[PDB]
């Protein structure tokens, strides 16, 4: 049952990973466009926000890898 | 009395004999070197930069100079020598122009932020008719002194001048001053002023600087972060300085890989965040600098570098050593109404 | 000798033609420099509680054409202006242009009409502005949109010591609880949303009540707002009673972060599009020169809403339930 939990947690991390890379790409392409400073400040603030959500997802993935390794050592 | 102490003379200008006789006489606009031009230089510098620069001691007939040579002294120590081509005046004109009227040009780039185009001084009315401003060699001395005092802010902003300007401020803004000196000790305040005028940030607008300090030093006592907050509260002055009156500002940018390897610079093991950075990269970025730069003409000002917010000062501290004529700014120090034109891609 | 010089707050640069115009008296024979600018200052002080400094006029700018003008904030120019020659700015209905265009700042009208037509506009009940009055309006827009740099700590001290002449023991009670810097911060947080601070008495009473108990600046600003019920209601209902979605309210409970000294907008970024997409398709355009409509929020989240929506629509006032008189009646 722990492999299914691992798949759950890896999907929940990968959705956040995809959103974070989308935000990075949008940062880069609004830098390339020539937007204003409002846009770049706001997107950098939102990236600083979603960094914590990415790190929480990574920590949950690490906990689930701990539990899956423990169940393998069973 | 020859049996006392004497105070160190800040800035001495030695001339050889011919320039010393040239400063005897009045100019076209009738002005004296010693009585008009130097004070007007001082006042213009004070309007440009927030700095009270001291008066100048001019000694004629130097043994150590030819007659058309000059020398400037920092604290009774000579700092840099100059030469003047005889019977030539310095105006920055493009090589195209220097050959579009068939005048002489002599290439002599005397200091770095100054023109490099010397034309025989009998051609003055020609340049007036062609609407080209030219500078008297005395005015060339004035320009070179001005370049000195811009580049040598650091040696003249010490603690007693900071005290003098604060005590002028007390006449008008005494409770603001009292709050600031509750928040910031006088030596650390002088350090903040020094780190501002490092990047040619004027402190003429003392009011906004003191207001920003009295906001931000409620929480933070590091001098350098407070300097960063003063910069980010001088959005308006920075934008007017660098975007030069436009709808838009035309800057360079970094590469995000460079930004994410200058997160390498962290030094939390020490008190200050001194530079923990791969040694080779001081060439590795800098080559991509040298092949990117537009050479600005000499009477204007250089292209700007736009960085991420937290790494602006490290970039400036790195790149001042070869290119003192880069202004580094980051996103927080411009108005978020300006359109930024992405035209460097430096990797 | 040389000395220091003080930073000059507001400098008004003029071209040659405007500099010749300000020599002479206006239609009612009153002066630009001696009456109209002081009257602007007095009206601004009566509308919002702020003592603006006197105005530094330099004529004959080298850098402007003769009907052009420039405004300086702390000897740094803020916005350049133009005046069409011999035109007055009169908001029309566009069809008028064929029964009988320059938008200068974003709250100035966009209709310049040749100045000879005065009796037509007086008979037709059409209000007109002198170009001098247009300068007055643009300066007023400046000082509304640039309040923040003129409400500093020494002016707060000056108004407090004016107050001490009448309410000294109230002042001493307030300043026992509250340092002067935090009081100036409260004033700035008020005048961010164009809340006037002319009525110092009610603000000081609310402070002297609430600051026994609360030492956060931001809650005290909220309580001053909730004690200015009457002023807010009169501003916003125009003397009437009746002239937002729960899901957003229940997702702004997400923004609880208070570990540091301040709070933190802690929110899925995409909602900055979720409000705004529905926001632009809901807004009524109120007539140019009027008052945009007014946004009603939950009590504790008002500041977050105002901080969010100022960026594109700065001239829309966020208030919450506690800040209106308790008798007045999309996502």
Residue numbers in the entry:
A (entry chain O): 33 to 106
B (entry chain E): 362 to 708
C (entry chain D): 363 to 462, 468 to 610, 615 to 700, 707 to 708
Provide text from the study.
The export apparatus is composed of a central, nonameric, ring-shaped inner membrane protein, termed the export gate (CdsV in Chlamydia species and SctV in universal nomenclature). In T3SS, SctO is the key link between the export gate and the ATPase and is poised to transmit mechanical force between the ATPase and the export gate.
The CdsO protein was truncated to residues 25–110 to facilitate crystallization of the complex. In our crystals, a 1:1 stoichiometry between CdsVC and CdsO25-110 is observed, and saturation of CdsVC in this way likely aided crystallization. CdsO25-110 binding is mediated largely through electrostatic interactions and stabilized by the buried surface area of each face of the CdsO25-110 coiled-coil with one side of the CdsVC monomer. β-strand 11 binds the loop connecting each helix of the CdsO25-110 coiled-coil; interestingly, this interface is mediated by H-bonds between backbone atoms of CdsVC and CdsO25-110.
